[PDB]
Every structure is written in structure tokens, then in C-alpha cells.
Amino acid sequence: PREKLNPPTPSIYLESKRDAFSPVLLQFCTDPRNPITVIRGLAGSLRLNLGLFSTKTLVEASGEHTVEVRTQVQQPSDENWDLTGTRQIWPCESSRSHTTIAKYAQYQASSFQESLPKNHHIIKFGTNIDLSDAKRWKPQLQELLKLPAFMRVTSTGNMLSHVGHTILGMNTVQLYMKVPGSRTPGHQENNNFCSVNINIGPGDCEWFAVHEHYWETISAFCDRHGVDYLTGSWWPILDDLYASNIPVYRFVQRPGDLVWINAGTVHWVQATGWCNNIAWNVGPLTAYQYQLALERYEWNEVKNVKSIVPMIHVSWNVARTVKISDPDLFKMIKFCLLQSMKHCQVQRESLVRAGKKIAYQGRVKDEPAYYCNECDVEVFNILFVTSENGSRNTYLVHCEGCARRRSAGLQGVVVLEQYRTEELAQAYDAFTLAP
């Protein structure tokens, strides 16, 4: 039906500051039935100084900051043309280049003055601007502390705050600078984590969204139309989605509106006017989020795609410090930890059978999680390490399989252990369901 395929977008207005910190807001935003939530006038309700994220202020703060530019052909939000301009296509490719905030700002500003749409046919979209530097963006980041706990960049209830190190763009803030038509290709978030997006303005963003439930159908369209779902750049053809009985949420994000994207929600975005957007990810400690995160973590492994969130590392840290009261979530984490212990044990036994030494490395403060140099899989605890350079400057971490796959096998490879069996066992036994 036409009505069901065009469902109303979940919306909230906060009449006061008290409403923003209400438990009702959390359960609404995280409800699996709500794939996306727009909070109207959130900035004003919480008195957020969005002027700190204005183009003028950003240029003053760091004019030489790196801006990743995406050159694009401008086209209506419901269109993506082939080279002949006679049919709709899924792939939406863009050329990548680099510039500065100051230089993109001038393009953004001049372009705005040209119209008394912009840049004619071809436009540039300033993406992936890094606001992780605490000293450089102090007033900007401090301003975001006015948000309720579950939406903050850092909180005890956010899985990404238990990683122990920086994951660029997930537990640090990214800035987008846009002109009309600036297009954000379709995707789910890294490891199906939730996301927060605030429109700074002055212009609007147009949003499109599909519930996580339909993601495999979206992936099959991408495969049918010759583009990588997880890693490629694509723009859904809306008629294809409606022809497959897939409801599409459509709404406008006006200046000061916060968009909350729930776990696994497929979404694509286009700027209607000139605007800046700020964004980051959040991983609420719930069974719904954890399940979706683990299954993308595994699916990533099947498709040889790096999981940007090291879910095994995160699950252990969470287990070590956070009390989980939900039985369903506890079961999932407890199982993940047990599987990890068994996996580590199997590796140690095989290494000891082969007569291969294992040195205890230990962990240090602010140490990153390790990934395989070849296949990009998370390498937890047992590290197969080699020296690429003649000196001890360049160390490469490999997984068991890739280490074994080397021409000389494990010769030259030093095997390290970051957590002893007893460390994991004692952390595991300490992890119990909260009352």
C-alpha cells in the first residue's frame, strides 16, 4: 500500500531541558520500532551554541585543517543518472581530493553569494573533517556535553567509551561542510552502531532511511547493480524499493535538529541548502545494539572487510568495568567472552604442540586493538608479530592463519600473549548479572 510504504518519521520536541534528560527519550530513540528519530529544536531546548560550529568559527579555529573533498554532479535527491542521462542507476561515484577548511569555506561562502542550488552542475562536498583534537576544538567539544548522557561522545553507557582508545569518527566528532546537492551515499554505520547527527545550518538536509530488517534486500540490489554494499558508493532507486515493498522514511533535518539513527538503519542523505553537519557514533549497552554489532562484526569477516570497532576487545573491557542488569545482553556478552577464551586456548595448545615459544607482552595504557596486516581481522590477545624493516621500528601484527600462510611459516614470527589464561578467566568469572 502507498501509505505503509511512506511511513511518518518519528519526531520529538523537547519543551524544556528536563524533557531532554527524561528516560522516555532514551527508550523512544532506542526502540527497535523506531529506525530513525528526529528531535526538533534540540539545540534551542538545551541552549547549544551551534555558532561554535559555524563556518566562520571553524575557519577561525583551524583554517588549515584538512578537508576531504568529494566532487559530485549535482542532481535531485530522488535521482541518480547514468552517463547518457536516460535511466536511473544505483552506483554514485565521486572523485576524492583534499583541501582546507578555509578554502572550502570560501567556496561555500562564494557559492552562497552566487545565488544571491550552486556551482551549476558540478559541486564539491567537504567530508570527514576531524574534530578529535581536544585542545584545538575545546569550546566545540565542551558544548556537546550539554546533551543527555546516551547521546554524548563519551558516556559509561556507550560501548565506544569502553574501547580504551580513539576510533576516528565513532568516538570522536566528524564535521561535514555542504553545498546544495552534497550527497551522502547509502550505508549502515560501522558495526551497525547508532549515530547522532546535528544540522548546524543555515540550510536543510534531506534524509532517507530504511529499517535494518530490509538490509539484505538493499545489499542484493547493490550486487545486482554492480556495487559493493558494505564498502561501495550507492544511491537507492526509490521505485525499486517501493517495488520490493520496502518502506522508506523521508524527512527534512532543519538547523538545530538532532537526527538519531538507530542500530542498523540503512540511510542516505543530501543537503538541500548550504549547511554544516556534525556527527559521531554511539553504542548503547542493550541486547539489540550488541546483537546487531556482533553479527555485522562476523559478516564483515565473511566479506573480508575491517570491523572498525574491535568487538572482542570491547566486550572484555565492558565486562571488566560495567554491571549489566539485562539478562539477554548478559547472555550475549558472556557467550562472546567464553568463545574468545576457547579460541585463545586452541591457539596456545597448537603453538605449544609445534614447539613454538609464546612471550608475555602485557597491555599498556592507551594501547590500540590489533588487526591482521593481510586480512584486516581483529587479532585479540595472541599476536603473531614480524619485523618488516631491518630495524625494530616497523612491527606488523598478523592473525594465526596469515602467519601460518607465510612462505617460512612461523620462522621469524614472534608470538606474543597480552592476556594470560588466568587474566581472562578471572575477568570472566567476575562478570555476573547485576540485580
Ligand SMILES: O=C(CCCc1ccccc1)Nc1cnccc1C(=O)O
Ligand atoms: O558519511 C558521510 C560522509 C559522506 C562522504 C562521501 C563519501 C563517499 C562519496 C560521497 C560522499 N556523511 C553522513 C553519514 N551518515 C549520516 C549523515 C551524513 C552527513 O553527511 O550528514
Ligand SMILES: [Co+2]
Ligand atoms: Co551514517
Ligand SMILES: [Mg+2]
Ligand atoms: Mg563511509
Ligand SMILES: [Mg+2]
Ligand atoms: Mg537481523
Ligand SMILES: [Zn+2]
Ligand atoms: Zn589474517
